[PDB]
């Protein structure tokens, strides 16, 4: 995900530049070129943490007819009515003494603790009490569900559930009536490229490529996710990951600003400082080098690197574009000078190699 190094797989011609035309690279937007207008906005997200089974409780309303004639009781069944059932429910809940009860009487019994599990994708409800274990949901046309007895209905004791969201603040990235993505509250850029429309707990939103769900008004037409699609929880570990990445990118951006400013005030363009101008994220950027005291740039598209051996296969080889890149004197772009013995030296790789130290050929061998 987060590379150990970035080398350009595409590179243009070296043009001589003046130091005033140097700039520290943008490491925020990831491969959504042209989308650079940032507008601070708000967006919805899944609440942070684990989301247990969303329970909503209801009540089963069954209808009987009791005939008493001169201590003999006949008992018949009939299918009830929603509003009457809820009136009986208010009776039994508020403690109204009017619910306890050749004369016949119609009674409506209401067994209260009938819990159901609510699907967040579609607001369907799940309990063994429905036909097939599932009801379509409680819309406003259908204020009740059916049971397998088909003479007893189920109604919710509706008062909060689907309280699985939060309102976060971020930055919308665009370039004119097209939003490519957004910086989220953690500070990491997420791309809308390839997302699909997902309606979660009745809230219209989008599922990104990485499986995260957000809710934002997109000025574009996107197709719906298939009925099979799922979204990822907003677990604390995802926030940890984003915090680590953003921490690093901020740190290295400040270090690059200190380097660029230390170049302006001195006009001393070394190779150590030039490495701080490298683009740390896959995408289009710039590459720099120094030929015969002259300071030049080139357009480039940086590709994420996974291992150090990928770009150094042999003695003085810097694999760029499939073949080893040429060196003038002993330097390449972004300060990858050839080493003391014509090997390739990358500043980041040297730092990486050092922290692995203590490991090989302790060589505390002693003479005779």
């Amino acid at each position, epitope marked *: 995900k987060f590379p150990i190094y970035t080398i350009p797989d595409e590179l243009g011609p070296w043009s001589p530049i003046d130091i005033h035309h140097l700039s520290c690279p943008n490491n925020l937007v990831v491969e959504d070129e042209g989308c650079t207008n940032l507008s601070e906005f708000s967006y919805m997200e899944l609440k942070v943490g684990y989301i247990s089974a969303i329970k909503v409780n209801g009540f089963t309303c069954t209808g009987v007819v009791t005939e008493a004639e001169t201590t003999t009781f006949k008992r018949k069944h009939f299918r009830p009515t929603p509003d009457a059932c809820r009136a009986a429910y208010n009776w039994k809940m508020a403690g109204d003494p009017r619910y306890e009860e050749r004369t016949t009487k119609e009674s409506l019994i209401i067994i209260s603790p009938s819990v159901t599990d609510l699907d967040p994708y579609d607001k369907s409800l799940h309990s063994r009490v429905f036909p097939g274990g599932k009801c379509s949901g409680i819309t406003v046309s259908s204020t009740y569900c059916s049971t397998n007895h088909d003479y007893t209905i189920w109604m919710p004791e509706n008062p909060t559930p689907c309280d699985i969201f939060t309102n976060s603040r971020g930055k919308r990235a665009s370039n004119g009536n097209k939003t490519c993505g957004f910086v989220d509250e953690r500070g990491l850029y997420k791309s809308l490229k390839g997302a699909c429309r997902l309606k979660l707990c009745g809230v219209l939103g989008l599922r990104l490529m990485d499986g995260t769900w957000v809710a934002m008004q997109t000025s574009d037409e996107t197709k719906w996710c298939p009925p099979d699609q799922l979204v990822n929880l907003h677990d604390f570990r995802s926030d940890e990951i984003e915090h680590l990445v953003v921490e690093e990118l901020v740190k290295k951006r400040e270090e690059c600003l200190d380097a660029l400013e230390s170049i302006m005030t001195t006009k001393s363009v070394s190779f150590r400082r030039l490495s701080h101008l490298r683009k740390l994220v896959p995408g289009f950027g710039k590459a720099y080098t120094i030929f015969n005291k002259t300071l030049m740039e080139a357009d480039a598209h940086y590709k994420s690197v996974r*291992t150090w*051996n*990928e770009i150094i*296969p042999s003695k003085g080889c810097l694999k760029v574009g499939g073949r080893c890149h040429p060196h003038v004197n002993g330097v390449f772009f972004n300060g990858i000078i050839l080493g003391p013995d014509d090997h390739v030296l990358i500043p980041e*790789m040297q730092s990486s190699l050092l922290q692995q130290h203590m490991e090989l050929l302790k060589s505390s061998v002693i003479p005779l």
Partner: single-chain antibody
């Protein structure tokens, strides 16, 4: 020249380890990286990882992280790989390989060590080929995405090391007969051999070098 000496075989026990050796000579041991590949009985070649004898940097495919460990000894010019917690699924032939000067295609292979225990996918078509000698034949290798012309064709006779026949889908190799040729454009590559002969019945693998990690085709048998 150049030789990559390997030892014959090791018979190991489930759950134990073994350390395979690869002594390189003919070139400077530190001037090139060292790769390692696994080949099960009647299977294709699978890249395990590589090591730089100078820096000591290692690269591993996710399948072998924790299973294989790469080391070197620069005084003796010998690379070692250790396999611990062996299961029956680890019984295979383990080759050590040496790539080109730009690390695109495999230049040299070792004898191989059969250890006995008791990404871009390359869709290679067909698995088996049954035709008579003297005919002209051509099999296909198709990549999961665009790879330009970054693919190489290897021939492997029985109990032998793979031998590179074509580099970059069309370029010939000096010392190898003129019967082999390729046609590469985009995703679909075809290796054609005219005038099939007796020593040309073997397994043929295609290998891409466009993206990391390195992957091979399933293989085509004659």
């Amino acid at each position: 020249e150049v030789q990559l000496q390997q030892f014959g075989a090791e018979l190991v026990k489930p759950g134990a380890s073994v350390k395979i050796s690869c002594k390189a000579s003919g070139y400077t041991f530190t001037d090139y990286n060292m790769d390692w590949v696994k080949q099960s009985h009647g299977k294709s070649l699978q890249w395990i990882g590589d090591i730089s004898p100078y820096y000591g940097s290692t690269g591993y495919s996710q399948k072998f992280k924790g299973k294989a460990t790469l080391t070197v000894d620069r005084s003796s010019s010998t690379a070692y790989m250790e396999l611990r917690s062996l299961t029956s699924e680890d019984t295979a032939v383990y080759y050590c390989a040496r790539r080109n000067y730009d690390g695109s295609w495999f230049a040299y292979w070792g004898q191989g060590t059969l250890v006995t225990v008791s990404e871009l996918v390359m869709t290679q078509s067909p698995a088996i080929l049954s035709v008579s000698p003297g005919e002209r034949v051509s099999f296909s290798c198709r990549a999961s995405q665009i790879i330009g012309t970054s693919i190489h064709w290897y021939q492997q006779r029985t109990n032998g090391s793979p031998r590179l026949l074509i580099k970059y889908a069309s370029e010939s190799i000096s010392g190898i007969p003129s019967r082999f040729s390729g046609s590469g454009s985009g995703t679909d590559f075809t290796l054609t051999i005219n005038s099939v002969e007796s020593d040309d019945i073997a397994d043929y693998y295609c290998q891409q070098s466009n993206s990391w990690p390195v992957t091979f085709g399933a293989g085509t048998k004659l």
